[PDB]
């Protein structure tokens, strides 16, 4: 009745609605007209028309048709890495036909610290449409997703409906991030919701609680990322997982002079003469400064790097230039954190260096046994399973079997006691993969041989001292490169598995295929039994 | 209609106001020209009114854009520190360009009773900004950030537009206190509206329930202090976390003979030569009143003196001065509250003393252990974890390895029971840093050997007798030079850190850096063995 009223009709009129559009058009028409000084009940209607004005329909982005741009963009987002660029224009591919996907959403997974953002950026440049976000990490309600229910002011529609409603294309890169960190403890699982939102027979007809009026959203196309490859099964129907891997040392440089030092170079008000590092700067910051995967340290050692240049520039006039190198690094970052090389460990007895397997990219863990007096009792600290029972006692086994062969007194398993330690046990590694080093380490304990140090092992060992395949060979190589270690020891089985390994990786460590035990004992000890 | 929509209708015109402003201007005009004495209908809209006068606009503070001058008022905020003004001037420098954050926010952590509200101050000052505070413990509705609905008269703006109406300037700096204490019960979790007026890309459009009108708050600076580093994950983005530290004795004793003292005469309303303190007897407070990092206590004792100065020479016209030393001070405070000094602290067996790394600043802890007879099962109270129950194991393991070393009964471990008790093990340290300190009481439980007082330590252990790395030696090392501790014992991998620490900590105590639990054993134990 009052002149709100009437202007609130007008945006009804003023914008071209498809029929779903005009029935809550309709809706809100019948829910106007009332009186406008009513608490909680024009202001809601009045959002609702503003966000039926936001919506988008009958109208979209320019969505590209060929490849090769496609291509070429994607080229230039991170790296490229050739690997999981090309799953992605084959995506392209599959999609260059129609405007429905009708099956997967191209779910990424890896270590944090990689390039998924300029991924997703440049898969919504590569695509022509528009790029927006949601995080899908803490959420535990399906009031996050969608809206509330259509009453009193407040009610607002979910995350969902108000990114569309920012975005005017009925076409966006919807990106869910964090989908393994996602809950369900306070409305059951919002995983439904997802579904609805998701799967092509539902989103053509999802309905909000307070938009109750279904919506087309089958040409809106979703990209996931995560983590680990601990994703709830409802919401792996549907989607393909790419996994991602950590740099190389050559990779990581030649990111960081691409990308990383022009972004904080521009992000800190330098100019173009103002800071020039070279790569030994980089490299002593890759090997005595980070441990990771990512490039997140390498970024906050060259933003460390850029304010103190920054600083020391702006009190000083005089200073024309600053250089940073190899040496004076250190004059900016203080004493070095980390350690690189195994040349001088000062091989141990008791201790055996192994590869672990992890869900963000493998590490590399020190491994201990005490083999102290007492009655033949087995104990094992580290959060172990059953896995790692049978494993250590096919280990004590074969060296039961082998004590002769390495001067081991037969009656070592009655009258002493064994303390296997693992640390970081709990590791996303479903198989006991140190069988070899915890024999290794036994063998050590009784008899005092030393293991070699810059030498890394992982596999499966049987009763007859047979060693079987793993998985995950990428990740540990990768992590054996980044901790220094040249000698790495591998099943036989695993052998096949190198040539989808790039030479980068292979060129700097000293692999040697192993299927017995005793090979491992000779290439690891420093003595020959 | 009436007088008062007339007034009102003045202040629209008689205020200059931008696009955003001019809406928000024209939507309270529509409001407007109603009656008057319409109850709860033309207050709120008086309100707006005046909150939109209020609300500042093409007005600002005069930044300054010299660093020099914020170096000389940063020096005579507290007592300089020497080490975080640094990093603010660092920031400052990264600001001495454009008017843009974009980027951290300068985030202070530490334990209380530091200079925090000083260093805001000062920078306030230095940038030449007006200053407010805002305190963000206890929040947990989005209601106190924000405002409510727009309704009935009572439906105030939340906190930050009532700070931004009374500071009438559209670039001040914003003090977020208490960032840790802020928690999400009423109001679903009021930190993405913290987020929405803390992003370079959120504030500029920020909208208020009440003032739902976009307004623009890109130009606010923003500076967030805490006291523990536990700070909600979606507000770390866009923040540098910066921690500080305790004070020494000197530079305590500076610290009060240069700003407390002169505050708590001032305060107290006395004279320039009515009371005189010497530094005797602000070091006999620091040392038998007083157990913190910061200096509250300081504070406390110093306004009793000066109270009870002003009583003691009110009710005496003869008294022409008070002066307290060292001696008299007890007259003023009473009998002494605490110990200062390890010397005759009558070293015992099942006690041993050691330094735990908390968020507030490291504190001394004393462990003990009990060996009574039994059947060898392991008990320990303190409310530990895991870590503590392999670290116990290790040490256990260690002490069956050496019994005959340390003439030890082989047999102790399955006739006789151990309780370890480690008080306040629920501290914020992650990592069991007292392995060697349970591994010394331990060895004096089953030996008898008393340990030696006025020794500290702090570290890992291994199976194998190594003493691993630890964090946060600064804060021990203060922690036991505030106890009067002279001999504390670090890991040897650890000495590189050392050069970071300032001479006023080192100079003294008496490190001993150590890698193996022989060393330990040899420097913590009255005897040999």
Redesign the interface.
Known sequence: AP?ENEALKRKIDAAKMPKEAKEKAEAELQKLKMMS?M??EA?VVRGYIDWMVQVPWNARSKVKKDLRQAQEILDTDHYGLERVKDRILEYLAVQSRVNKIKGPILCLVGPPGVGKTSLGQSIAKATGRKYVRMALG?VRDEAEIRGHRRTY??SMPGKLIQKMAKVGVKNPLFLLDEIDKMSSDMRGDPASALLEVLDPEQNVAFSDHYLEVDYDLSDVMFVATSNSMNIPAPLLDRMEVIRLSGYTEDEKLNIAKRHLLPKQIE???LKKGELTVDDSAIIGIIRYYTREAGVRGLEREISKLC??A??QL??DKSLKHIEINGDNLHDYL???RFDYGRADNEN?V??VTGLAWTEVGGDLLTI???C??GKGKL?Y???LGEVMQESIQAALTVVRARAEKLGINPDFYEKRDI?V?VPEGATPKDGPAAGIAMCTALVSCLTGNPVRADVAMTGEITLRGQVLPIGGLKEKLLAAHRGGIKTVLIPFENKRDLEEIPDNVIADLDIHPVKRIEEVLTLALQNEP
Do not use: F, M, W, Y
Request: glycine content about 14%; hydrophobic content about 25%.
């Open positions: 002149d000084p608490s909680a202001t803490g002011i407040g992000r800190n008000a304010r103190k920054v600083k702006l009190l203080g004493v070095q141990r008791g201790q201990e046994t005490a102290v007096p104990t600290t580290g959060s303390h330690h």
